[PDB]
Each structure stands twice: as C-alpha cells, then as structure tokens.
Design an enzyme around this catalytic site. Structure first.
Site, PDB file in Angstrom:
ATOM      1  N   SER A 169       0.803  -1.219   0.000  1.00 49.65           N
ATOM      2  CA  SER A 169       0.000   0.000   0.000  1.00 49.65           C
ATOM      3  C   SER A 169       0.837   1.271   0.000  1.00 49.65           C
ATOM      4  O   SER A 169       0.289   2.358  -0.201  1.00 49.65           O
ATOM      5  CB  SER A 169      -0.926   0.008   1.212  1.00 49.65           C
ATOM      6  OG  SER A 169      -0.188   0.079   2.417  1.00 49.65           O
ATOM      7  N   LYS A 205      -6.651   5.282   7.723  1.00 51.57           N
ATOM      8  CA  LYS A 205      -5.648   6.047   6.991  1.00 51.57           C
ATOM      9  C   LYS A 205      -6.090   7.493   6.801  1.00 51.57           C
ATOM     10  O   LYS A 205      -5.285   8.419   6.953  1.00 51.57           O
ATOM     11  CB  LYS A 205      -5.373   5.391   5.641  1.00 51.57           C
ATOM     12  CG  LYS A 205      -4.658   4.062   5.730  1.00 51.57           C
ATOM     13  CD  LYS A 205      -4.364   3.512   4.350  1.00 51.57           C
ATOM     14  CE  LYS A 205      -3.681   2.167   4.433  1.00 51.57           C
ATOM     15  NZ  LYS A 205      -3.357   1.626   3.093  1.00 51.57           N
TER      16      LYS A 205
END
Ligand SMILES: Nc1ncnc2c1ncn2[C@@H]1O[C@H](COP(=O)(O)OP(=O)(O)OP(=O)(O)O)[C@@H](O)[C@H]1O
Ligand SMILES: Nc1ncnc2c1ncn2[C@@H]1O[C@H](COP(=O)(O)OP(=O)(O)OP(=O)(O)O)[C@@H](O)[C@H]1O
Ligand SMILES: [Mg+2]
Ligand SMILES: [Mg+2]
Lengths: 524, 7, 523
Positions: C427, C470
């Site tokens: 990611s 996030k």
C-alpha cells in the site's frame, strides 16, 4: 423371566448359546447380588441389539432420484452412487453395506446429504460425531468387569435405532484425536473393513456382531485420514460450487428455507436473481453455500425489521441495485479482461479452492545489463517457470525477430500485480513466455485471450489442473479465446454448454501456436 | 471387590 | 419417589424412555452399591438438565435499543443484529438462535456486549471461557464408566441456568489449544453446527440434547480460527474507535462509572473535553478504551487523595494544561505533517490494528554505481513494491526528464525512519514511486499531500485496504489532500462527514495523475 425374550429374539447361534448360558448362570444366583446385576444387565443389553431385524430398502429409482433432487441440488455423482446401490439392492437382498467417504471443502453438503440418503434408501438415519473423539471406548466399549460397562456408541446406536440396516454418518474422520494417549481412528479399522465386519468383536458383548449391511457414510474436509483407514473407504470428492450451481441452490433450496425460517408471507419480499448473483460475485468468496444463506438470511431479516418499523410499505424488492443499501459496501471483486491490446501483459488463468480467477502477468523490459527480477510474492516453481520461459525465448531468438544479445543488454522484470497474495504453480508458463516474446519485439498481446499451460524447453505445452473453474473465470470476464493445453481436451466433456458455446477454446501443442494466436501481429 | 476403570 | 420427578420434569420421548428404563434397571439393585450409584448419578443428571423450560424473549424494539444504548456506545452493526433477532422473534414463536463471532482488537467491548445483549433480549446469561482450554472433555465429558464422571461444562451450565434459551458467551475461541494431544475446537464443531444442534450427543448423557435455540456469541481477537469453525459462525468485525467516539464513550460511559467507583460527588471533580482529548492524543495509543479508563481512573484516585490530604481545596478542575500535574509526561506522540516541500520524502498512510498512522518515506539518490539499499525493517512484499515502483520510474524516465542511465550512475536508498517497527504491504508503493521521482529530479513533494495505493508495471493504481483509519490518520496529522486509488471510492461511503469535509480527496487511476498532483512542479 427372560427366556421368552431370548427365544423371541431369533439370534444367531453363538449369541444364543452365550445368552442362554448366562441365563442358566443367572438363575442360580441371589437376585440382589452384584453378579446378578452384571449378568442381568448383560442379558438386557443382548436383547436390545438388532440381531436380525431389518428395514425394507426402497426399489424405485425414479422416486429416489426425486427425493435426492428434492433435498439437494447438483451433487450428481453421489446421487449416482445411491441409485447404483438401490439397483443392485433391488436385484438381490443382503448386500454388503457400502462404505463411503465424502471429501470436500466446508458447506458443499456432506453432513446434510447423509439424511437424504436415509430417506431415499428407506434406511434409518443415525449419526456419530467423531470430531475430537479421543476415547476408544466410544467405539469398542469396556468389558463388563468394570462398574458401569456399556458396549460403545456403535452398539448403543444400533440398539437405539433397532434395525441392522442403518445409515451411520461419521462426521469428521480427519478430526479424530490421534495420540499415544488416545487413538480411536485405528479402532475403526475393524468397524469399516469390507471383509471383516461380519465378525466385529465388541469388548462388552464378547460375541461377533455383523456390521456388513450397515451403510457407512463418512465426511471429511481433507485427505489427512490415516492411510490404513483411508484405503477402506470409497472416496467421493465433492468439489466446490460454480456460480450457476450457487444460483440454482440459492433459488431452489435456500430462499424457501430462509423465507420459512423468517416467516415471510407471499407478497412481502422478492429477491430476484440479479441480487443473488451480486451476492455471489461481490459479497461471498467461499466454496460452500453457508455464507450465501447468511447473506440471504440477512436480507430477509432486514426486510422483517424494515417492514415492522416502517408500517407504510408492505413489499421490498431487492434488485441488485439497492443490495448495497442492505448488505453494505461491496466486499470483494473478481478479475476482468482488459479492453485494449497491450504489449507486455498477458491474461493468466489461476485456480484456488473457492474458484478460479484471472491473473495479470506484466513484464517490463528496460535497456539495462541483464538483471532478472521477478516480483509478486511468487513461489519457486513459478520462478523456475519464468526461467524456462526465458530459455525458450533465448533458444528461439532468431526466428522471433529478437536481437539475440538481450541477455546482456536488457533488464527484465516479471510482476504479477496482487503482491500480497502468494502464488505458486507450474501453470502460466506459456503465458509468461508469451509476455516475454512480447516487449522484446514490441508485438502487443491481444486482450481477449487468456491461456494456461506448463512449458518445456523444447517448446511443448504440458497439461494443467482444473480447467472447469478456469474456463468459468475466463467466461466470467470478457475473455473470448482461451488457449488450453492439448491433453486437457479430455476435460472439455465436463464443461457446461454456455462456456463451450461462448468461449473459443483452442488446444495447443507447442509454443508457436500460442504465439500465433495470442499476438496482434504474427511473430514469425 | 469390584474393578472400576478410571481416566 | 423418582418417577414423580421423571414425570414432573417432563422429557421428550427418548429421554423419558431412557430414564424410565434406567430407573427400572435401578429397581433390581441393592441401594448401597457402586452400580446403583452410577445409575442414580445418571438419573439425577438427567433430572437437572432442562428439557422444556424457556424464557420470554422481549418484543419491544425501542426499549431494547434503549438498553443497548444504555450499556454501550456505537457498535451499530451488532445492535442492528440484536434488534433484527428481536423482530424475527417477535413474529415467530421459535427460531434457531444466532451463532455470532465478534472479532476485533482488545478493549472494544465484546465481552460486556454479551451481557448487554442478554439483558436487552430477556434471555438468561451464561459465560464459558475457552482461553487456553485443551481438554475436549470440557465440552462432551466422559462415559459413566469412569469414577467421578459428569457431563461437559456446556451441559453443566445448561443444568445450572435452568432454561433452554440462554446466551452463551464463548470467550477466546481462537486461543483454544489445537494439536494432537488436545483439540476442543473440533469438539465445538458439533455444538456450533447450525443444522445438527437438534441432536447434540455428548459422552455422559448419551441421549440427544437440543441446542438449536441457544444463542451462541463468540469473542475472538483475530481470524486465527479453523476454517470449519469460521464457516459455522457469523463474523461481525468490531473495528477500532475514532477520536470522537472515544470522546463520547468517555463522556457518556467511562466518566460516570469511574465517578461511581470512587465516591466522587457532583461538585468535587470536573473533566472537560480538552483533558479527555489530550488523554486520547498523548497517553493511550490504543484501539480499545481500557487504557483510557485507566487514565481516567488515575485522575479520579489522584483527585481523591488530593481531596483528603489537603482538605482546604474542595473542587478539583482537570483540563488540558494540568494533566501533566496528575498524569505526567506524555507517553506517545501522533505523526504530523511536514511544513516545507522537500525533495525525496513522501508521506504514505500506514495502518496497524492500533489504528492508522502517518508513514514518512525518504529517499537519497547519491552518485554511485547503481546500489539499491532498502532499510527500515521492511517486509518482502514492501521491498518487491519498491522494486516495482523503481521499474515504473525506470521505464518512464524519458518522459519524466530523468537521465535514463541512473541505474548505473546513482545509488538509491529508500528508508522509512521508524526503524524498529516492522512494516510490510504494497500500500506504500505509489508513495515509493513518487519519492523516487522527486529524488531523481529535485522536484520536491509538497508536504500537504499524503497518498496510498498499490503500483503495477503498467503504471496503474490498484485498490488497498483500510481507508478509514488512513484518512483519520491524515486528518489527525494535518494533511489537507490525500490520494486514494480509484476502486476504493466505495469506501468513501462509510467515512465520517468532517473527514470528508476537511480532506480534499482525489481518487487516482494511474501514476502520472499522482505525479501531477503530489509534486510541486510539472513533470
Ligand atoms: N447442493 C446443495 N443443495 C441444497 N442445499 C445445500 C447443498 N449443499 C449444501 N447445502 C446446504 O448447506 C447446509 C449445510 O451443509 P452441510 O452441513 O451438509 O455442509 P458440510 O459439507 O457438512 O460442511 P462441513 O464439511 O464443514 O461440515 C445445509 O443446510 C444444506 O441445506
Ligand atoms: N462502546 C463502548 N461503550 C462503553 N464502554 C465500552 C465500549 N467499548 C468498550 N467499552 C468498555 O471497555 C471494557 C473492555 O471491554 P470488554 O472486556 O467487554 O471486551 P474486550 O476487552 O474487547 O475483550 P477482550 O479482552 O477479550 O479483547 C469494558 O469494561 C467496556 O465497559
Ligand atoms: Mg458437516
Ligand atoms: Mg474480553
């Protein structure tokens, strides 16, 4: 007394001899003594065992096919096994009881099937759960010297059923506790042994008891059964379900059951096939159908609370577009074909236990110094498959238009995009060879072609495993042409007519056919 | 006197 | 004497025939003998076990949501599940009873949530702890051959509670032993089987016992459960708590009960939002609320001894500046954004089970011989992600204005400065690519930009997991614009409103969109 019961129970010879011998030994003792309770309890166990009482096994195959198709969908090979049993049973009586093992992933209908056979053969259903069983005395009991001695759950369940033709379902053979302190899986080596069940000696009964006509169906998730026990069982491997099979199971068996468990009336809820297929594509990623009926049960249950707390609407239609409003956000996704023909990218076919999927196989060939790098959490057999592909390309470098010194002048990166998921296997070697012939020539790989196969250094294509889920994964995408190995043509007789009629399936022998079909401009 | 199996 | 107990506690057919056959077997025995004790033990064990007694399950949904909101805050999916159970139970006299597996990080309230459910449904409450349990005879028991034998602890708890509709709370179902010597997880495979609970045959009471109406709720910390058990349970994922709902749990549930546990009156101690949010930001670093209520309880007992040892100040007011007077030095520090646009560093978004955090990624490209060193306790998927990102920069270096022989002439060092913390996953890959482009051009990455996403050699951005923490980490850190992948737009449907309002969220599809947005100058 007992002699009208011992005479009334038409036993075999030696059981009658030992039973009557215990009777005349019983009639010489004080009845309030402990030996009278041992012998009296022993006779009271010997009278309950079904020595010759049987159940009439069915004979009509069409009606039994209608019962097996009534309770379950699609499991064709086990239903064939039961119809063959009812045919040979229909010709003669006192056959040996079939010993079966059902092997599959969770939810494919192994335990729930074992009652349907007990309605289709007219037998009596009985079930022993062998998950985590460590005591051998559940199978063979103790001798009657000890205080509370019972003949084990086999003879207890034969005595509870009352006939000598039951259907024992043995759940989780592979989950029995094998240890130096406890190993009952080897005590079953006498229980299910196709030529020794006629004399099954029990530690409590002490007389040989016939288990030859008891129908043994066992269920397991794997092949980790001990090989002395795995050999005695006719093993049927119930594979995972496809999308049309999960559709028909979901709409013929799961929707009436979950409407009935939630008390849905007639014009009160309507779940069409597009929402069911959206559950299959987008929310569930299993091989069975138990999370599928979880999502169906959640749809029906949310419909119940919405109708009970709204009171103005009286009909909910979930048409796959508002399925997002009920189940939540889309959890998983499947792979699709690309829409444009690209150079260093082929479409590989992969297979796992929940189904098939498409692989993207990307190559980048930069002017460098011959460094070879392979990313994507690849196994070692796939890396050896890339090295075999590079050897095929370097052996055929002249007749493909490739500059033959690219092993010193070009750096090659082979990447498979989902780097979080581990991948291993000999297959997609002609895919990686195709993606290496491209991006050394500038020839684009055509985007509507998927392929699978194992490559040799001579250029041959070797067979692979599991064409059915791979052709369903290619049919689910926008793939139109599938390149299969040649010797996998013998699998194409077990593919549905939709996949055969839609896909242009080419079987190939060597790599020149693969490069001839799957490239926009002819390689040679 | 009577035997008795313990685990 | 005993047959009026057998006829009184009325059984089904097989249990009554077995028990009356057992008493008729007892009638020809001496009373003080061992086999008489085994038979009497089987009889009164068959009498203690409930066969027909139930409990009136509640029907009012509004008062049930009032109880569920009285005990816990948030947790809307499990409360939806309980209200939907009470709706279907309001229509149907008897249904199968749900089998639930609550899965989440510690402290998120899944053990106390069970007793909240049993209070809100009217069902009786039974707890059984499975943490470290290795013997499978806790579930099934032993035969009555054995001296001192008895049923499994499930049947003992059913016989204790007296009804056939309890709520079982299976605590730590993943911390059960599973080896050759002991496997109770495959012994639970019969009792959690949603079709075969109508005949649960254990080893002591060898009759079939019906468990197809017991509500099973299991609590675990991870998906480390065997795949047959996971398939028999309904998994509900309890994610970690945000700042606003930790503030609301603290104001609505933790402060009144920690005031109640310390005899604090209404006019002695007052804690405002500045102290609570300062505890959340600078002392906890958790996913649950258990160290949060430990800090709150520490404030309360320090307030108590400061009201006893002084006795001339009778009102203590804790707020944002005097927490260090009570709690002391700030234990943790959240990641923050950078203030200047700097060449070579980007800010990826990392996510662990504690929560989301900012992820600084830095690159030095010194002139050398093409050495590639990657430090910072990287994984193997992360290093393959940096190799893929470097291949994307390398195959595109003519367009980007980069001297294409940098793989020979320059040495590249990708570093993630947390160092001791291990870090893995693709990611960060887009972030890696951006950093490399910056460190090959002198074009600085603007510090108000975070990003996440996976990279492929074609240049495309692939979806990633866990956007919510996030984006909460970028909003906490001071980021004003993030870069998510395209196919994660759906996850933006479940983000809170202030996070969407503050963050300028740009979904990207390929790499030159990222290099167009995240760099200061045009590439
Ligand atoms: N082919 C099918 N048609 C209809 N229903 C099915 C089918 N396969 C499975 N089911 C449904 O799945 C449910 C549970 O299946 P079952 O318990 O037999 O799975 P299993 O193979 O025994 O799983 P496991 O091996 O993990 O125990 C049943 O209620 C049954 O209705
Ligand atoms: N939403 C909430 N509202 C109120 N209190 C909560 C909430 N979430 C957690 N708590 C509190 O956190 C404490 C810990 O929760 P609990 O012990 O019930 O589950 P858990 O700690 O997640 O379980 P485990 O220790 O097995 O991980 C409880 O005392 C509970 O009061
Ligand atoms: Mg099963
Ligand atoms: Mg707990």
């Amino acid at each position: 007394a007992l002699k009208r019961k011992i005479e009334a129970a038409k036993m075999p010879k030696d059981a009658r001899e030992k039973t009557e011998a215990e009777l005349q030994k019983l009639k010489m003792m004080s009845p309030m003594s402990a030996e009278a309770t041992v012998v009296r309890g022993y006779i009271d166990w010997m009278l309950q065992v079904p020595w010759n009482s049987r159940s009439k096994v069915k004979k009509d195959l069409v009606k039994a096919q209608e019962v097996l198709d009534t309770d379950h969908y699609g499991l064709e090979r086990v239903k064939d096994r039961i119809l063959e049993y009812l045919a040979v049973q229909s010709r003669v009586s006192k056959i040996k009881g079939p010993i079966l093992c059902l092997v599959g992933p969770p939810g494919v209908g192994k335990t729930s099937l074992g009652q349907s056979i007990a309605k289709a053969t007219g037998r009596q259903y009985v079930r022993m759960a062998l998950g985590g069983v460590r005591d051998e005395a559940e199978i063979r009991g103790h001798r009657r010297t000890y205080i509370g001695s019972m003949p084990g759950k086999l003879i207890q369940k034969m005595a509870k059923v009352g006939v000598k033709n039951p259907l024992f379902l043995l759940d989780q053979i592979d989950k029995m506790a094998s240890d130096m302190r406890g190993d009952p899986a080897s005590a079953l080596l006498e229980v299910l042994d196709p030529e020794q069940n006629v004399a099954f000696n029990d530690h409590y009964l002490e007389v040989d008891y016939d288990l030859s006509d008891v129908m043994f169906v066992a269920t397991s998730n794997s092949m980790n059964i001990p090989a002395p026990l795995l050999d005695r069982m006719e093993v049927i491997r119930l594979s995972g379900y496809t999308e049309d099979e999960k559709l028909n199971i979901a709409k013929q068996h799961l929707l009436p059951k979950q409407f009935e468990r939630n008390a849905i009336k007639k014009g009160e809820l309507t779940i069409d096939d597009s929402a069911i297929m959206s559950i299959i594509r987008y929310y569930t990623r299993e091989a069975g159908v138990r999370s599928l009926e979880r999502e169906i049960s959640k749809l029906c249950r949310k419909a119940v609370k919405n109708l009970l707390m709204d009171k103005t609407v009286k009909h909910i239609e979930i048409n796959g577009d508002n399925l997002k409003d009920f189940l939540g956000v889309q959890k998983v996704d499947y792979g699709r074909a690309d829409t444009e023909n690209r150079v260093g990218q082929v479409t590989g076919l992969a297979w796992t236990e929940v189904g098939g999927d498409l692989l993207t196989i990307e190559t980048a060939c930069v002017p460098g110094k011959g460094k070879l790098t392979y990313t994507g959490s690849l196994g070692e057999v796939m890396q050896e498959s890339i090295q075999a592909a590079l050897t095929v390309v370097r052996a055929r470098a002249d007749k493909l238009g490739i500059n033959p010194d690219f092993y010193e002048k070009r750096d090659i990166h082979v990447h498979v995009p989902e780097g979080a998921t581990p991948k291993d296997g000999p297959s997609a070697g002609i895919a990686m060879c195709t993606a290496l012939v491209s991006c050394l020539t500038g020839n684009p790989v055509r985007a509507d072609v998927a392929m699978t196969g194992e490559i040799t250094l001579r250029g041959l294509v070797l067979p692979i495993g599991g064409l059915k889920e791979k052709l369903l994964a290619a049919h689910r995408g926008g793939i139109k042409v599938v390149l299969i190995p040649d010797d996998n043509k013998r699998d194409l007789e077990e593919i549905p007519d939709n996949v055969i009629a839609d896909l242009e399936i080419h079987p190939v022998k060597r790599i020149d056919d693969v490069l001839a079909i799957a490239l926009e401009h002819p390689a040679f | 006197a009577a035997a008795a199996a313990a685990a």
